[PDB]
Design a protein around this ligand. Structure first.
Ligand SMILES: Cc1cc(SCc2sc(-c3ccc(C(F)(F)F)c(F)c3)nc2C)ccc1OCC(=O)O
Length: 270
């Protein structure tokens, strides 16, 4: 038959975890070691105002468009970060069993409508209630500083903190997140898919693997699997809202540029 047993699902999970470790430089384990002070290096440089942002741009190890103003500059660094994670997600996807065998067009479609949900999920790993890590972990920008940016740029990031804090309360590790992100990517609900049943099948397999994985890895947790399915739904709404805010910037901040790679992702949604 075609219905995988527990042993098959466990092996499937291990392969996805390996593809994860292979393709992501900033894992939650690494991020947490930095954020909890376990790292052997000194605490990250803190960006909490204009003076420190300027200093970080001069002393922190990171081709942006010409400087215009603080809020727009930060907007550009958001884009750059996003582009890098998109490249990692693409390589991660290619390494997930049964992704590379989908129609090329379906692979493209899945990444296009999937990357942002995945980005916001993984973002939680490098975030706490007070800020997030930048410059590959060597910097830390405060939530308060991002709130100080002028509208509409301040309105973009705050929603992600709200989501991340609650998401982090679930206490997932990298092994869990590997399956979660795979499930987000291999999503049979995306528009323009040629072979929906194939994608549906793969997603369901990933989800079953995830349930069994959570059982062993978090034996004492309650309703963790259902909670994560809800998180997936929450991410869809987060992205819709984020895309709306990006469109507003596109129409009102005509002096602000958008990376071509991100332009295509958002191309056919407005
Ligand atoms: C505008 C925008 C915001 C987000 S919210 C998640 C954030 S915040 C962030 C960041 C914030 C401040 C700095 C600073 F100050 F420079 F240190 C920094 F380096 C990095 N990086 C990310 C991923 C996500 C995407 C996006 O546009 C691109 C798209 O939608 O594709």
């Amino acid at each position: 038959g075609s219905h995988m047993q527990v042993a098959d699902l466990k092996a499937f999970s291990k392969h996805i975890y390996n593809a994860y470790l292979k393709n992501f430089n900033m894992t939650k384990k690494k991020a947490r070691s930095i954020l909890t002070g376990k790292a052997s290096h000194t605490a990250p440089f803190v960006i909490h105002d204009i003076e420190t942002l300027w200093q970080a741009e001069k002393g922190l190890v990171w081709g942006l468009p010409p400087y215009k103003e603080i809020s727009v500059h930060v907007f550009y660094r958001c884009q750059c970060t996003t582009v890098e994670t998109v490249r990692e997600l693409t390589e991660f996807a290619k390494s997930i069993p049964s992704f590379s065998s989908l129609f090329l067009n379906d692979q493209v479609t899945l990444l296009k409508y999937g990357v942002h949900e995945a980005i916001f999920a993984m973002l939680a790993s490098i975030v706490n209630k007070d800020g997030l890590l930048v410059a590959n972990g060597s910097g830390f920008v405060t939530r308060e500083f991002l709130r100080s940016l002028r509208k509409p740029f301040s309105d973009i990031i705050e929603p992600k903190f709200e989501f991340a804090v609650k998401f982090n309360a679930l206490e997932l590790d990298d092994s869990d997140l590997a399956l979660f992100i795979a499930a987000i990517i291999l999503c049979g609900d995306r528009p323009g898919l040629m072979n929906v049943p194939r994608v549906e099948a793969i997603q369901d397999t990933i989800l079953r693997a995830l349930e069994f994985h959570l059982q062993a890895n978090h034996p004492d947790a309650q309703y963790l699997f259902p909670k994560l399915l809800q998180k997936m739904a929450d991410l869809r709404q987060l992205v819709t809202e984020h895309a709306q805010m990006m469109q507003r910037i596109k129409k009102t901040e005509t002096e602000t540029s958008l990376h071509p790679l991100l332009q295509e992702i958002y191309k056919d949604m407005y």
